[PDB]
Amino acid sequence: LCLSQQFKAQGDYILGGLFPLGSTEEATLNQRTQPNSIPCNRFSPLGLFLAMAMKMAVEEINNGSALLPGLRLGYDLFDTCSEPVVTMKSSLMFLAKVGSQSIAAYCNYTQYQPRVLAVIGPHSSELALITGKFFSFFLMPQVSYSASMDRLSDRETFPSFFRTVPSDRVQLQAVVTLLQNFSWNWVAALGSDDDYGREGLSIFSSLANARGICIAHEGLVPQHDTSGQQLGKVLDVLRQVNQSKVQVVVLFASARAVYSLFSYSIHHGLSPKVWVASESWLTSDLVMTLPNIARVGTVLGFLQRGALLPEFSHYVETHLALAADPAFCASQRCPRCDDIMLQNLSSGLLQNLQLHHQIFATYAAVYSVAQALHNTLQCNVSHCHVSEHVLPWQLLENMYNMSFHARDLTLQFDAEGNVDMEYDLKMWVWQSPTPVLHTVGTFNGTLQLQQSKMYWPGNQVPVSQCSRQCKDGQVRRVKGFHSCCYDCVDCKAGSYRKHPDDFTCTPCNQDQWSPEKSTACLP
Amino acid sequence: SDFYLPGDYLLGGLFSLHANMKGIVHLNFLQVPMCKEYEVKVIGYNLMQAMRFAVEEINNDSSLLPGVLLGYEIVDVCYISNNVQPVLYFLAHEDNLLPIQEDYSNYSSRVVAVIGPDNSESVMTVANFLSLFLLPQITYSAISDELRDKVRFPALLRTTPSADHHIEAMVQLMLHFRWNWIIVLVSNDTYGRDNGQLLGERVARRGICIAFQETLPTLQPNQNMTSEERQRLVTIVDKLQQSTARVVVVFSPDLTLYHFFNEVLRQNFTGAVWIASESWAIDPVLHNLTELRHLGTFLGITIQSVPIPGFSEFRETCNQECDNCLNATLSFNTILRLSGERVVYSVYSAVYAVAHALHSLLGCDKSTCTKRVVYPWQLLEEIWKVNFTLLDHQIFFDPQGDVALHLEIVQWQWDRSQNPFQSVASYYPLQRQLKNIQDISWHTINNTIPMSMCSKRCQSGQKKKPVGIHVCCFECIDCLPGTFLNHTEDEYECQACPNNEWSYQSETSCFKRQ
């Protein structure tokens, strides 16, 4: 197939792309000793679909006059290879001079032309940091279709990074709004023992403390069942949560980790609880394999929503069919993309893909740059002011304030580079033999619940409040992983409570006596 | 100017001569950030002169590189600002163009090695470039543990122990003096939170309770504060004064502290032990606020002293100049002179390590070396293998890239004409133990060791019951008659007397009854 030739197209302006379009074997993970080129000979399917989404977006923009009339938008794509070195090589290539394979170390750049207008950024947060600290020096606008880690919103260190997906902070703001709205003021938190779970805990604890939610217990869970160090902790946290008298718990982890814990519980009869799920766990297929999951109790979570593309599969298959025609040549980046055949790349793969929204985000990304160019040229309905060739920093000047369209959905970047898009709230029904992720509300900045659709196991609203106030006659005995809440103790007879802002009861004198809960002693 | 010397092989240098805590990271009006305007940092100029002295010795010494002129070129990286471009400058050809080749095995940059930045984020920002070329880089003061992953950073070496050993030294110092109850302060940047979390993972297992942790605002010393930041600082100091924990551990860049301590003085605060991380345990500028002597005892973990003979006498294509440095350093020169070299030795030993690596790679003999075209990736492979004594000290690299220098704890002393930062104890990382603690002078009424604990030890026959999450905090309650405290088996619960025996109110045992 002619596939790898199709990843480069001419035009007046050119977009760069970094995709997980290749990879390398385990044998290549050694410490390097000579700066040879990396053998990215290990093919990957997901990057191909994301790159085809980008190609389709550019084709739409080039066909319709609605954007950039009278000029052509081009591109050439590189694979990240999930490797920092290859990603850096490609990023260095993007900033080379037009018509040359070299980059200048000048003192100033007032008339310097890099060979691309914008870069559609890498698939992972690690590479997003690594490359954002480089592109933003040249003020090259980089638009990432999937990098949700919080740190990249910092405008001080990343003055030119943008993304078409919400950050983790948005998801956890939705979670905290849910906790606030049902007055679940006293909760526990778990995270997987990887960077994802630790960062989830780091964000959630800060947000909860900021909004007056009190964390009873923080812990972590393994996503494996292979060592004593994992087994011991995964049972330990199960003991500790019960001892804390908590009823609501938040888990920020991958599916295996959570159901591993549940499975252990299912063995030894854990009590029911309310569990709040990250979408990486809420995806139900492999978890519903548990034969008695009804013992767990209610599970809730938020899921991203967006207008999926209605015709992407037909486009992919059509252009693969075109790539198979040997005459199509009349019309390396990947050692093997030319040989992976249509049959194994058939619709089954993209139907298995729940990451369909990342196909949208890659599509939306392109438009965000295209619109930004359309604004920067101040184009008419049928004219553009092409008298001068635009440079990336002039594009950057125009992106923080724009609005753009992606099919039915409409989007804007905010002042720290994120787009704002809504979430569904879904409850995990197991009662029917066929389980259901039933929608019960939405988050669009405010949690529009739909109460009548809620399921509870006993038809009762769970409650997990804690006493942040106590009576005049009660001692405020502090508790919590942070000292945010109290459990009230009645002041015993024979002692006096003093004024309620003090924290300890004291014995009465010999000639005095006091009943229970008294502030002061009687004679 | 000082910033360049020609030679047959050039070292690159990256020193923070100027510094601002919120410098501009991107092109300014499409021109490289000009470093000159971020005031000045005398410590960085001292380290730069340390490198210059090392190269002067290596050219003067007829034995280490016979017939080879070792040159250097220096660029000042103003903290995290003005990274990238110095790297592109070092890597590019003589016409300042860096070709993007498919394979660099035959490539020849300006420099054969880089004496890397002094800070973790800058070190990573440079390493993610140099790893592409496998051009060796040796950093003298970046302690982050992340820099020990050779897969991620294969070209990166250090002449200083990692952060793990600094935290271990802090915790063992706390254990020695029995400080179960501490306060931790961190800056709002990655250094502060990373070190704070690292200390969190350590303090718990050894049995020490972190009373609370507080994020300092990232203030700027030459800039007047707003009322809001003043409110935050007042809140922090009042959090300190309200607490029983009189041991305070500070993880922050040095510049953000000038205001903090000033406010601590204005709040009439006194009576605490301050434990400084390596970022500011040595600071000629902050030490000069002599009224600090009234706040309490000032201790810090730092690199060990190694006196460089003759260095103090020696000290008497953009971002390569400094007007302020000389007149600025002449004000500190006396207080610098009395302080034996500590980090200067890191810079000095790094340069000597590159010198020995090159000496071996050129196949050199004491008569003459065979000059050639040294591709940096060969020099890295040779650097990994060096081993030699520099000043009575063996320097060689771990498999994971660190030199195993000692750490040292220093007390601040304000009597001039003697060492400002005097040694109190020495920590050995390859033995992972603190040793040879000497006579600290405390602020207390009669020089008794100051103490901080959440609770007093219970009386005999009196069991503990915990309060709060902090294990160090408990209430003491007597085992009532008929029960006794079997402290040999449990401290938190009592046991009951046999039938023929009974116990008094406050005892560990039972008497035989009537």
Author numbering:
A (entry chain B): 23 to 353, 367 to 388, 392 to 561
B (entry chain A): 25 to 340, 358 to 555
Question: Which text from the study accompanies this structure?
Answer:
The sweet receptor is a heterodimer composed of TAS1R2 and TAS1R3,3,4 two type 1 taste receptor family members that share the distinctive architecture of class C GPCRs: a large extracellular Venus flytrap (VFT) domain, responsible for ligand recognition; a cysteine-rich domain (CRD); and a seven-transmembrane (7TM) domain that mediates G protein coupling. Unlike other class C GPCRs, such as mGluR, CaSR and GABAB receptors, where agonists stabilize inter-subunit VFT interactions to promote activation, the sweet receptor is activated by the rearrangement of a TAS1R2 VFT loop, which destabilizes interactions between the lower VFT lobes and the VFT–CRD interfaces.
In the presence of sweeteners, the human/mouse sweet receptor adopts two distinct conformations, which we refer to as compact and loose. Its chlorinated fructose and glucose rings are oriented nearly side by side, in a vertical arrangement, allowing multiple polar interactions with residues lining the interlobe pocket: the chlorine interacts with Asn143; the hydroxyl and chlorine groups participate in a H-bonding network with polar residues including Asp142, Asp278, and Glu302. Thus, the loose state shows the highest degree of TAS1R2 VFT closure, whereas the compact state may correspond to an intermediate along the activation trajectory. The closure of the TAS1R2 VFT clamshell induced by sweetener binding leads to the formation of salt bridges between LB1 Lys65 and LB2 Asp278, which are brought into proximity in the compact state and engage further to form stable interactions in the loose state. In addition, a loop in TAS1R2 VFT LB1 (around residues 45–57), which is disordered in the apo and compact states, becomes ordered in the loose state and inserts into the interface between TAS1R2 and TAS1R3.
